[PDB]
Amino acid sequence: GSNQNNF
Ligand SMILES: [Zn+2]
């Protein structure tokens, strides 16, 4: 799956 981190 794809992963995104928005700090
Ligand atoms: Zn993945």
CA of 1 to the centre of ligand 1 (A): 3
Three-state SS at 5: coil
Q: Resolution (in Å) of the shown entry?
A: 1.0
Q: Compute φ and ψ for 3, nearest 5 degrees.
A: -135, 140
CA of 5 to the centre of ligand 1 (A): 13
How far is it, in rounded angstroms, from Cα 7 to Cα 2? 17
CA of 6 to the centre of ligand 1 (A): 17
Please state the length of the chain. 7
CA of 2 to the centre of ligand 1 (A): 5
CA of 3 to the centre of ligand 1 (A): 7
